[PDB]
Write a protein that binds this ligand. Sequence first.
Ligand SMILES: Cc1cc2nc3c(=O)[nH]c(=O)nc-3n(C[C@H](O)[C@H](O)[C@H](O)COP(=O)(O)OP(=O)(O)OC[C@H]3O[C@@H](n4cnc5c(N)ncnc54)[C@H](O)[C@@H]3O)c2cc1C
Ligand SMILES: Cc1cc2nc3c(=O)[nH]c(=O)nc-3n(C[C@H](O)[C@H](O)[C@H](O)COP(=O)(O)OP(=O)(O)OC[C@H]3O[C@@H](n4cnc5c(N)ncnc54)[C@H](O)[C@@H]3O)c2cc1C
Ligand SMILES: Cc1ncc(Cn2c(C)c(CCOP(=O)(O)OP(=O)(O)O)sc2=O)c(N)n1
Ligand SMILES: Cc1ncc(Cn2c(C)c(CCOP(=O)(O)OP(=O)(O)O)sc2=O)c(N)n1
Ligand SMILES: CCC/C=C/C=C/C(=O)[C@@H]1C(=O)[C@H](C[C@@](O)(C(=O)O)C(C)C)N(C)C1=O
Ligand SMILES: [Mg+2]
Ligand SMILES: [Mg+2]
Lengths: 576, 590
Amino acid sequence: DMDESFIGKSGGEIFHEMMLRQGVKHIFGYPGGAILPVFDAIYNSKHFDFILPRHEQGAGHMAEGYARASGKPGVVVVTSGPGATNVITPMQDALSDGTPMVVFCGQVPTAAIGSDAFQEADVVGISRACTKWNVMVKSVAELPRRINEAFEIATSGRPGPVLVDLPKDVTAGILRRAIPPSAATRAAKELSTQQLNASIKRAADLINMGKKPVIYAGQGVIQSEGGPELLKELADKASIPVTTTLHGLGAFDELDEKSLHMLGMHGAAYANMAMQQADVIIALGSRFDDRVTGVVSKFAPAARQAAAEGRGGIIHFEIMPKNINKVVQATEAVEGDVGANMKLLIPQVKAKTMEDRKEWFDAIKGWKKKYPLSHYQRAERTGLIKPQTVMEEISNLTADRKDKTYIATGVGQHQMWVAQHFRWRHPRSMITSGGLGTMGYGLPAAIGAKVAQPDALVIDVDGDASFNMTLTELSTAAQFNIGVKVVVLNNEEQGMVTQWQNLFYYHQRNPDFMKLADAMGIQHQRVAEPDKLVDALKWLINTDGPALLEVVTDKKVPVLPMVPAGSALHEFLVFD
Amino acid sequence: DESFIGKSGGEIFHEMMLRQGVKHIFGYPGGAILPVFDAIYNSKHFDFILPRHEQGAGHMAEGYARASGKPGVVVVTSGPGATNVITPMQDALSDGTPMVVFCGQVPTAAIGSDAFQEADVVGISRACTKWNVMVKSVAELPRRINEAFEIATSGRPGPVLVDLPKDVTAGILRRAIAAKELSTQQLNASIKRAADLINMGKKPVIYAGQGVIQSEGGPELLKELADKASIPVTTTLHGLGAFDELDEKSLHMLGMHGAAYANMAMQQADVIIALGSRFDDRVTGVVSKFAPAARQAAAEGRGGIIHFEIMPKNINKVVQATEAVEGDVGANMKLLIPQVKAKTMEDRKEWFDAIKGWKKKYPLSHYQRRTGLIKPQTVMEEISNLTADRKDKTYIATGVGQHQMWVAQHFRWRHPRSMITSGGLGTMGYGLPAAIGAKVAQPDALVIDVDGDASFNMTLTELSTAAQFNIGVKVVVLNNEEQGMVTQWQNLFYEDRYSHTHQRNPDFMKLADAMGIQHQRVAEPDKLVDALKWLINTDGPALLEVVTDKKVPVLPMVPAGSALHEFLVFDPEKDKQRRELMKERTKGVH
Ligand SMILES: Cc1cc2nc3c(=O)[nH]c(=O)nc-3n(C[C@H](O)[C@H](O)[C@H](O)COP(=O)(O)OP(=O)(O)OC[C@H]3O[C@@H](n4cnc5c(N)ncnc54)[C@H](O)[C@@H]3O)c2cc1C
Ligand SMILES: Cc1cc2nc3c(=O)[nH]c(=O)nc-3n(C[C@H](O)[C@H](O)[C@H](O)COP(=O)(O)OP(=O)(O)OC[C@H]3O[C@@H](n4cnc5c(N)ncnc54)[C@H](O)[C@@H]3O)c2cc1C
Ligand SMILES: Cc1ncc(Cn2c(C)c(CCOP(=O)(O)OP(=O)(O)O)sc2=O)c(N)n1
Ligand SMILES: Cc1ncc(Cn2c(C)c(CCOP(=O)(O)OP(=O)(O)O)sc2=O)c(N)n1
Ligand SMILES: CCC/C=C/C=C/C(=O)[C@@H]1C(=O)[C@H](C[C@@](O)(C(=O)O)C(C)C)N(C)C1=O
Ligand SMILES: [Mg+2]
Ligand SMILES: [Mg+2]
């Protein structure tokens, strides 16, 4: 069957109509020459709100935070050439962290491609390696199909960024024509179904054998329909302790007695202890990246010994086949959506009580007593604010509304401190750049997050160097009155790299953040005395509209515990 | 050979910088590049500039390379460090700026595993570099640094990217490291043929671009040719400064926002001598209607298009050259001039009388000027006036948009490399970072960033870099509260439907105050001259905000679909009824 409703509409007008059909309600973008047919067509549209950032890197990272906070794909519209290349970093960022994004960019007319035309770049060639799929739309008649293909690809499997190049003749032009089982299919499907059920049955047998089980949950659980609920059901039924990755934070309730909190190079000592001695590791929507495993050959020794002896090992619930057996050899690989497959797993996992796991949870509670996160060096009343305490007091101050609190971060020491010291209870509350780790992410991601969740508290916990990268987007929050709260940790150092240069081998001076925030039209306060911190934070989270709070912290504060390079996950250095 | 044994890849890098004459490095640390960073940071052999954003690092390296003819050197970490340099890289590829981007990478054993901060950077940056390579072993490090500097500076210069895996730069080095030129006969034959074309030309025009400024001895030779044969000279945007715009033969800039008289001359010339330029679509208008008089001449055998070009892929890409002269334009101009016959201005009275008549008919000074709000063209005219005694030590970097065309049109360019601007990619945000790198390259010169507000908003965080390092650039921010160039396009083509082309703007006085940078704001026509006098006479970084008139069109304009001679010109009556129809639609808002 064929669609006639586009006949006589420009490509720009068709685009505006496809945003309607795709449920898009917010677009982030910046105009220019090649994309003008599309901007003219979304001119004053009542069908979605349009955020104009300062820089189209702002637009991309806002689209990521929007996606992180809502589960919907962030949509970006930029011009050809430098408008497209300015989104390359957010694209690689989204690909690394599985964030769904559709990036639409102008392109010179199809006839001009290859001529080195004004504002021409081989954007499909540049962006291939940093998108999950991309395409140049070559005729207004294929435009609605390509837009669909793009939205579906971004949002399925492991989500990811997709780039659609829109030549100016495609969007300024006028469409003039209408546009659009098996026996072997049933046998292929049953062959896949048998393979999946057998995998889940063996996964359950392994879990049922295990005397020291652990769930290693990641972002995939949060990105799965019903994932957190199913995870809770599984952890409760079999009384299994649960650790998350940085991106899995909030997938499990960190006030539950079974919570091990975050594992990894900067994770809880007890989470790492648990993973190093578990005999069954159940990896749910996580990818064994190197910040988590440490030296891979030393990762999970007891799980490997168990697999070796037929009495356990490593179970891996993964939707993307390329990520199965990439880094760690799974004893049992359960392919596909972790929500759907946990639904089939749980009724075959036998129930176990806490009392059944007394020895395991006694070891875990021992490690928690010995290595509590809350033990670090606190400020003397005449010193500067400790950064860990900033995170603790933000968590205390939001404890009664964690279901509507979104934390976005920069990259560095502060990103690890909030992971460690804020208590995570809400899925999608952690909005942070993990795989690529892009300083500058925090403020624009927080802005997009607040756009997606206008009724939530959204805080950008941002180190000063990171915040210096994209601080121009404060104008975006001010122009549009997007009520993000910004906490700038001013220590005048690139804390994470000076931590590395102090362990393995040295520091910039900041603008005046009160004057700057004044220049940008943002409510602002400064705070350096420990006794004043809590009240400063109460002011920030109760302001109306966008606000910023500078927290003068001291320098050379360690991130502990840390698993240094060359060490195993159990070879962490904690505070003494 | 054998001299580098025992040293780490970082130390080896450190020395290849010495052997390449690198005195200035722009960069930003990370884990994967720390071996290189430990090496060269703290060294007394280099000035290391640490910006806020690696994009700043790249544009800085571009402006440094524009003002100095030396390659800009960038050192960043893997992943987000390298991807943040992709726009500077594309921008440099499009404008032929020599640049060597060194970026950290994960250890070679970790590549392809989605390791921490890993990207396929050679894959991402292949399409936007001249060439790129991943260094696979300490031993190939010297050879690859050499090749990279060689490619970035040869032919048409451009950016190269070198991927440095962390184990290559931490590892220790333990090893050691017939023809017949009938081509000369043919080059010489075609230089002679080109001279015969110039000598027979009755209406010659030199169309000069950036390749002249990029060729050693290029401007000197361009002036000798133009003087000897009395040939009028027009330049592209990047060519501004290759020829003295105060010379009576100067036609100024051609193209979509070129002088009407330069465009006229190109369309009526019978011999177009194209020196180190590439027939950009911002230059030619509709190509089929470009250079009718020279195509007509070429057919009849009495003229045509001479193209002096170093990159073969760029000859005959857009326009058929009647006579192509491949190679360096300066070296080839040394061989051309002795074969060209001297002619005085008077020998060419008829041609220069046509040009003079075009100049009276369409002077660049005829724009709406009574003294309520400041007009952006006057700002550019006064900068030209106030630096007239020092144009040879004056460097202008710009953003992208109306202000960039206005300074192209209304500043009188006289110094090679004085025009520092993004023309090929056209990257808003280029100005301030490029001005910072230029002033690093020319510490004793006066360096000005003529920036529109939207452009400036893109990268204004680099004001901290000028403050921290005390890099004395002078910033002129034209405050019109709009994406001026795009509102023109929407006014022209879209019935004043101003779709998302207006932005708030921070308080620039407070912003400059916040960054520790001396600052003034001017809004009155009477005070403009004193404002700019204060700015150019400060010490260290400074910023001036000029509040200007809104909705000011850039004229003349050759709009889309027009031949180079079919331009629009300023009409006082159309302008006051353009503002009036704009007010009914926008319902009193504009
Ligand atoms: C300075 C710094 C320090 C860091 N330190 C740590 C640290 O100590 N600990 C830590 O954990 N991280 C740390 N990180 C973050 C780290 O680099 C990774 O980004 C993070 O570990 C990835 O977590 P993840 O595997 O849950 O998420 P992702 O990287 O998004 O992987 C999720 C996996 O789930 C799969 N998936 C998605 N949807 C589904 C579905 N429906 N069903 C099944 N599978 C699905 C995906 O395909 C993928 O394989 C740090 C980052 C930085 C910048
Ligand atoms: C908003 C906007 C408006 C613009 N409007 C105009 C306009 O009106 N007019 C205009 O002219 N431009 C304009 N531009 C700039 C334009 O798009 C191009 O960037 C510019 O015209 C290119 O100038 P060029 O050919 O001199 O330099 P390049 O693009 O750098 O080309 C130089 C050429 O010289 C060759 N070359 C290099 N070195 C040598 C050598 N040693 N010997 C021989 N050949 C050599 C190169 O290979 C290349 O072919 C505009 C840009 C923007 C953003
Ligand atoms: C865009 C970019 N460039 C460089 C890096 C390398 N890098 C750098 C320079 C870090 C220091 C972050 O400093 P900060 O002020 O933002 O936060 P802390 O002081 O709390 O560490 S952390 C890190 O991974 C990066 N992650 N991202
Ligand atoms: C990075 C980027 N984004 C978008 C564009 C598209 N674009 C835009 C948005 C222009 C308006 C520039 O406004 P300005 O304030 O910087 O200067 P004017 O008001 O004088 O035009 S000009 C132009 O080419 C671009 N060139 N570069
Ligand atoms: C390539 C980047 C540089 C861009 C410069 C700006 C160009 C333009 O702005 C116009 C424009 O945008 C109209 C389109 C159209 O919609 C119109 O109504 O006028 C029409 C085809 C229906 N064209 C064809 C242009 O070149
Ligand atoms: Mg810091
Ligand atoms: Mg402007």
